[PDB]
Amino acid sequence: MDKVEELLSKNYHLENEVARLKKLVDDLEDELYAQKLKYKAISEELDHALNDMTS
Amino acid sequence: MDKVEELLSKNYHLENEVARLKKLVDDLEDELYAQKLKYKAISEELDHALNDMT
Secondary structure, X not given: OHHXXXXXXXXXXXXXXXXXXXXXXXXXXXXXXXXXXXXXXXXHHHHHHHHHHHO | OOHXXXXXXXXXXXXXXXXXXXXXXXXXXXXXXXXXXXXXXXXXXXXXXXHHHO
């Protein structure tokens, strides 16, 4: 029928969205952790900075 | 009546999945942004720092 026609259509668009969101969510997960490691490393040279500047 | 019912159920689960993923993306974008505001605020401090001694 037609209620089936539109449902197939709506489900097609929905499945695509879900695909794009899952990938986006993964990309952000990585970007965010990469971010945290870059932040943690930014301090590593710093721990040696104020630490070696003190004594 | 058979597939029309299957279709509706799939559709329902998809709409909820989209809404949940959408909420997840928004949270990650916030965390990420917030992290950039600290990364930045910090950098601006080295400015007064590395050159402060130059």
